[PDB]
Amino acid sequence: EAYLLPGETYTSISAKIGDVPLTPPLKTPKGWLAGFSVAFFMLMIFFVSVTWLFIRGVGIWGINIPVGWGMDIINFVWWIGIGHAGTLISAILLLLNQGWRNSINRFAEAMTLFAVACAGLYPILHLGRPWLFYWLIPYPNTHGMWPQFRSALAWDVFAISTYATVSLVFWLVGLIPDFATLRDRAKNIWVKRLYGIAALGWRGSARHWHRYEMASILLAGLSTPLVVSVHSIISLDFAISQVPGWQVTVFPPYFVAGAVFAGFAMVLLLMIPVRTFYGFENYITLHHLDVMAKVMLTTGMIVVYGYFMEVFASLYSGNEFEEYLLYNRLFGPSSWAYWGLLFCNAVAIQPLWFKKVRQNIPALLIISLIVSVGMWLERYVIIVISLERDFLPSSWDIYIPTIWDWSLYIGTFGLFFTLLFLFIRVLPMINIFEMRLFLYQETEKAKQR
Amino acid sequence: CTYQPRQYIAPFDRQPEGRVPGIPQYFASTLTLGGYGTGVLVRSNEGRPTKVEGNPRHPASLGGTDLFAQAE
Amino acid sequence: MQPEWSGDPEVKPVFLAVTLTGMVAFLLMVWLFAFYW
Amino acid sequence: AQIFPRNANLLSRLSIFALVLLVVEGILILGVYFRSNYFRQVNVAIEQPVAFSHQLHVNVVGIDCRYCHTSVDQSYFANIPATETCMTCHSQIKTYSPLLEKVRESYATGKPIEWVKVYDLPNFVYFNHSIHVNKGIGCSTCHGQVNNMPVVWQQQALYMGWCLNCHRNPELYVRPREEVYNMDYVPPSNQLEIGRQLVAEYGIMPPDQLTNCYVCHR
Numbered sequence: 001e002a003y004l005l006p007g008e009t010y011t012s013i014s015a016k017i018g019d020v021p022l023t024p025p026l027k028t029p030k031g032w033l034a035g036f037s038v039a040f041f042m043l044m045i046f047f048v049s050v051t052w053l054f055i056r057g058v059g060i061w062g063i064n065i066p067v068g069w070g071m072d073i074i075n076f077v078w079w080i081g082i083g084h085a086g087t088l089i090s091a092i093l094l095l096l097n098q099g100w101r102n103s104i105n106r107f108a109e110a111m112t113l114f115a116v117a118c119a120g121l122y123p124i125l126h127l128g129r130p131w132l133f134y135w136l137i138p139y140p141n142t143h144g145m146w147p148q149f150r151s152a153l154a155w156d157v158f159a160i161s162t163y164a165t166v167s168l169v170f171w172l173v174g175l176i177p178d179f180a181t182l183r184d185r186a187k188n189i190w191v192k193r194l195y196g197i198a199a200l201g202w203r204g205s206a207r208h209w210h211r212y213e214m215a216s217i218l219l220a221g222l223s224t225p226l227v228v229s230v231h232s233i234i235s236l237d238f239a240i241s242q243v244p245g246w247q248v249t250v251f252p253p254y255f256v257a258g259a260v261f262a263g264f265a266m267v268l269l270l271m272i273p274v275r276t277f278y279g280f281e282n283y284i285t286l287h288h289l290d291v292m293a294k295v296m297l298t299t300g301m302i303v304v305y306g307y308f309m310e311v312f313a314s315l316y317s318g319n320e321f322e323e324y325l326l327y328n329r330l331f332g333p334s335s336w337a338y339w340g341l342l343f344c345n346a347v348a349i350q351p352l353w354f355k356k357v358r359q360n361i362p363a364l365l366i367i368s369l370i371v372s373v374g375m376w377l378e379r380y381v382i383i384v385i386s387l388e389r390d391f392l393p394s395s396w397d398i399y400i401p402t403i404w405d406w407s408l409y410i411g412t413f414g415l416f417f418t419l420l421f422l423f424i425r426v427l428p429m430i431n432i433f434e435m436r437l438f439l440y441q442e443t444e445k446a447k448q449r
Numbered sequence: 450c451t452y453q454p455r456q457y458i459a460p461f462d463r464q465p466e467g468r469v470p471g472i473p474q475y476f477a478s479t480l481t482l483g484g485y486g487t488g489v490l491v492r493s494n495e496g497r498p499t500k501v502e503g504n505p506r507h508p509a510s511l512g513g514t515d516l517f518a519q520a521e
Numbered sequence: 522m523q524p525e526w527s528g529d530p531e532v533k534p535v536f537l538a539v540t541l542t543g544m545v546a547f548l549l550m551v552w553l554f555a556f557y558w
Numbered sequence: 559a560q561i562f563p564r565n566a567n568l569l570s571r572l573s574i575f576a577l578v579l580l581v582v583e584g585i586l587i588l589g590v591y592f593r594s595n596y597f598r599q600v601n602v603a604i605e606q607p608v609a610f611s612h613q614l615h616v617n618v619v620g621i622d623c624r625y626c627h628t629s630v631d632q633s634y635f636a637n638i639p640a641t642e643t644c645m646t647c648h649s650q651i652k653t654y655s656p657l658l659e660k661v662r663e664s665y666a667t668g669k670p671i672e673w674v675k676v677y678d679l680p681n682f683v684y685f686n687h688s689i690h691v692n693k694g695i696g697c698s699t700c701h702g703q704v705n706n707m708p709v710v711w712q713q714q715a716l717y718m719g720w721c722l723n724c725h726r727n728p729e730l731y732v733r734p735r736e737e738v739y740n741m742d743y744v745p746p747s748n749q750l751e752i753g754r755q756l757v758a759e760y761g762i763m764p765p766d767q768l769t770n771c772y773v774c775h776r
């Protein structure tokens with residue numbers, strides 16, 4: 001169909017998108033109030049879990065001596081991997097000249113930043129001496145020491161910091177002209193200065209828009225290899241390690257695909273309510289959700305191919321350790337997660353080949369929810385199960401999470417949803433410009449036919 | 450705020466005679482499991498027992514000791 | 522295209538001030554972090 | 559001009575510049591405070607409960623430092639002087655004096671005179687005194703002229719910078735033995751030459767071995 005529904009003018013774009021922010025704060029809808037109250041409650045669960053993590057130590061988690069990376073690193077890889085599809089809409093679709101990114105890239109960039117804020121606490125939080133996190137950063141000290149810089153956590157620190165800063169930069173340049181519109185309609189005098197210095201007095205103009213498209217296309221060209229590498233490096237903190245299930249050569253493209261897959265699941269699960277509850281049906285059409293299910297289907301096939309590559313690596317090899325990896329994943333004590341992985345991330349994705357399954361909104365929402373849960377299960381199968389059973393059978397032990405792993409997970413959900421709710425309150429969730437430009441491009445296609 | 454607390458440090462009133470402070474001394478003793486004693490070398494750190502080794506001259510300790518002597 | 526401050530009289534001493542900022546601040550971190558112990 | 563006044567451009571440029579400068583200044587604050595002579599207690603004459611005078615005993619009265627620190631060339635721990643060390647002199651050299659009531663309170667009751675540690679390491683660093691004095695490094699390369707000190711201050715902060723500076727270039731501070739000689743010693747002009755000869759003569763090992771972590775930390 002069409003990515004934008006008709007009956008829309010530039011006044012209508014600015015009215016519909018711009019008036020979801022700059023509403024009076026006492027006129028704020030009660031559904032937003034309920035969601036933000038739930039997010040505030042879960043953020044207090046976060047603060048309690050982080051407090052007991054800091055006081056007692058990292059031993060409140062279920063980690064033991066074989067599994068040094070339990071549920072904390074799993075949630076780290078899941079939360080960082082959610083950001084790939086948001087950056088995909090942000091940068092890669094900007095590079096590929098894709099017409100469906102024009103209504104999504106604001107929400108995509110926003111949840112990339114919020115998943116980055118949720119992920120980036122986990123390298124600090126999983127230390128157990130977290131106040132020395134700056135030792136992984138090359139800083140001038142009186143000691144004269146350095147980070148090792150050949151470790152993959154040493155790559156992780158640069159990687160998450162650069163990724164956080166570039167995604168913040170892309171958000172700010174993507175937000176400057178929408179700041180310029182929201183300053184121009186705010187109707188309260190003090191709020192006009194607040195969105196004014198946010199816009200920097202953007203002054204939407206040629207010789208300013210030239211540098212706008214030029215820098216945005218070029219930053220998309222910078223961030224497009226960057227998010228692939230940053231999730232390759234999140235892969236590489238297993239892929240350089242000598243554990244049998246972790247030293248797999250397919251891991252950087254397979255973790256990149258799993259990241260886009262889980263992130264597209266999350267963008268589904270958090271934009272079907274944004275499409276329905278906030279009346280943005282014309283801006284986010286059904287063809288939008290069709291093409292997003294198609295891209296999720298692509299990455300799901302590449303992830304299922306990665307599972308096949310793991311099965312082929314374990315069967316083709318004559319090593320005992322890869323074969324016992326496949327046995328303990330298939331018939332071991334933690335084999336439930338691997339069976340739920342092939343039920344979730346493999347069986348439930350074959351529905352998305354058919355158009356009516358893609359166009360059905362409840363089916364699409366529930367299948368995206370299974371994608372997110374089974375993606376988490378894939379991180380569990382990669383990390384925990386391979387750390388359970390290793391080279392020496394004396395160093396074999398089961399991993400059981402405590403209440404504090406789940407407490408921190410639910411609390412990071414609270415931090416994510418809280419930051420998302422402030423985002424959808426003060427700032428607009430659809431790019432006002434680049435939808436007006438998309439309106440221009442749509443009526444120009446309707447002109448030249 | 451200061452890098453460390455003051456760290457008071459206490460010397461002797463009459464020094465121990467045959468030891469240089471900061472050097473462990475090894476003393477020979479005997480530790481009995483079921484009455485039957487094995488000859489041990491016990492490290493004297495600053496006049497207190499810290500580590501039990503085997504007395505190499507003894508029968509039932511030809512250098513080494515059992516675990517109960519080590520956890521004495 | 523040229524910037525809009527290309528033909529301004531402020532473009533000489535402001536961009537001289539960025540490097541006089543650099544050689545003051547960065548050399549201050551050099552003095553503190555290498556020559557101050 | 560619709561929202562902002564005329565000098566909004568001035569205030570915004572000054573505000574971005576000021577934000578950069580306060581970031582630089584806060585980094586300077588943190589670095590200065592972590593290297594400050596207050597933090598590491600450097601060149602601060604920390605008061606002892608008797609006010610022993612090294613200036614009066616070593617430069618004036620003239621006792622060698624192995625008389626009181628008898629363990630300086632045998633152990634890691636240079637011996638802190640007991641009460642009896644004072645009492646060889648101070649049972650006769652003006653006892654019944656107010657400056658020695660703590661010293662005479664000890665050696666009668668057994669409680670130690672509770673001295674305050676001036677040079678302090680963080681206790682997993684494991685300094686060894688015997689190998690430093692034995693390999694030609696004297697006091698006043700690490701303690702300064704203690705012989706002139708009425709109350710002793712820490713001369714420099716015991717960093718990994720300073721310790722690794724001598725563990726990477728030992729030729730600059732090594733001396734032809736005479737480790738325990740009084741601080742009348744001066745390093746000569748040919749410190750590179752005589753330092754290289756004394757490094758090769760004492761068996762001072764390459765810096766790839768002396769900067770190892772299990773050299774000091776254990």
Ligand code: HEC
Pocket residue numbers: 608609610611614615619621639643644645646647648651652653655657658661
């Ligand atoms: C002789 C070899 C000494 C020993 C060891 C210590 N002290 Fe002494 N001290 C000595 C003399 C000959 C003098 C100067 C003359 C004088 O008595 O004034 C000092 C000086 C002091 C003083 C002042 C007075 C005194 O009774 O000696 C004090 C308080 C002092 N030195 C402190 C001190 C302490 C705490 C000692 C034990 C480590 C110590 N001295 C040893 C002679 C000698």
Ligand code: HEC
Pocket residue numbers: 683684685686689690693695699700716720721722724725728731761762763767768773774
């Ligand atoms: C120069 C004035 C030095 C200072 C400061 C420190 N050390 Fe040193 N020390 C120095 C030398 C030249 C040597 C022996 C060289 C050799 O052949 O090894 C030492 C000896 C030590 C050792 C012995 C370990 C070893 O030799 O393998 C250690 C562990 C040691 N010193 C500890 C140490 C610490 C903790 C220091 C900082 C306060 C330190 N030394 C400073 C020269 C110098």
Ligand code: HEC
Pocket residue numbers: 142143145680683716717718721722725768769770771772773774775
């Ligand atoms: C003696 C020459 C050392 C060597 C070799 C190393 N360490 Fe050290 N370390 C030593 C000193 C004298 C200091 C100064 C204490 C201070 O903080 O100023 C340090 C410092 C460190 C610290 C900071 C300690 C802390 O903040 O808890 C660390 C973490 C440290 N050094 C690490 C370290 C490593 C990894 C080493 C092997 C390459 C190493 N040090 C060697 C003494 C010495």
Ligand code: HEC
Pocket residue numbers: 623624627630634635636637638677678679680684685687690691695696697698699700701716737738
């Ligand atoms: C070089 C490094 C030196 C050398 C040449 C001397 N001292 Fe020692 N000294 C040194 C340190 C790091 C310390 C404190 C110990 C610590 O772990 O921080 C000291 C301290 C002393 C002490 C205190 C007790 C102790 O060492 O544990 C005494 C006593 C002392 N110094 C005496 C002493 C004398 C007489 C020296 C000349 C031969 C001398 N030190 C040299 C570092 C260094």
Ligand code: HEC
Pocket residue numbers: 606610612615616621622623624625626627638639643644673674675676677678697698701704705710740741
């Ligand atoms: C009575 C003879 C006396 C002799 C000689 C003497 N000291 Fe001391 N020294 C003391 C006493 C007592 C202390 C502990 C009190 C203090 O910390 O000041 C001490 C401790 C020190 C301390 C303090 C270390 C610490 O952390 O507390 C320094 C520094 C020191 N001696 C250096 C020297 C040197 C170097 C010499 C050799 C020239 C020397 N002293 C000779 C009595 C003596």
